[PDB]
Design a protein around this ligand. Sequence first.
Ligand code: NI
Ligand SMILES: [Zn+2]
Length: 272
Amino acid sequence: NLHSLITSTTHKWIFVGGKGGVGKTTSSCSIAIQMALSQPNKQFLLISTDPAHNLSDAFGEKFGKDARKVTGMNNLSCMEIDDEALSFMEVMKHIKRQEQGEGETFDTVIFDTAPTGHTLRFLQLPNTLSKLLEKFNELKANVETIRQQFTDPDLTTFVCVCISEFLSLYETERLIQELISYDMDVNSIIVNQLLFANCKRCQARWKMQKKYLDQIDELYEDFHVVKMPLEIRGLNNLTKFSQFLNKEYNPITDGKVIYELEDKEGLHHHHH
Ligand code: NI
Ligand SMILES: [Zn+2]
């Protein structure tokens, strides 16, 4: 589970990459909602390159190229955006230089990467860029540093999200393998949509699920495996689902609590 980040005082950067709409936006939320909720004050500020903008949709408010902490959050702003490098670097330092001015420093960005998978290039711009310079000046020293500074794990940790389904799993295999080419921190991944222990005609789907869970256990020992039950829209609805993000969910709790949380969104059973 992700209490290492829910707590980590030391991180300036947290990328939640999860191209797939697997409530990835919701992961990003819950981590920021849970972090800021746990580190009572010390405003973290949440962006999502997500071209969809599910994030604004997520908290129940419309954000954009501007910060704006949410109603009830004494310590958490949000933000969203769309060559490709242009998009990144310029608008990347848009947020950087943007908050240098808006008042003072502000602690760290939950970076909900674009599901577009275009965020891959958004993540190697500086590497090959510092090359051009070293064999062709302010930002030049900056890139060599920040490039090593993104490499540095006690500052820049990535974090993937999954459904049980095998296909994601493979894209996550190939994904991480690319991430290490970058040489970035990664050791942590959350999974979604899990059912647990009538709706046994549903549990018959968790069966196949449960197994896929075990292929990721054995396959990744160096990593947290966050089993997350089951997209919400409210702040509270969202905040409660973060509570399971940090504190290891549990099928006695999970049970009574999520039975309540679905009966929220108007969901004598039935599938179809
Ligand atoms: Ni129906
Ligand atoms: Zn069922």
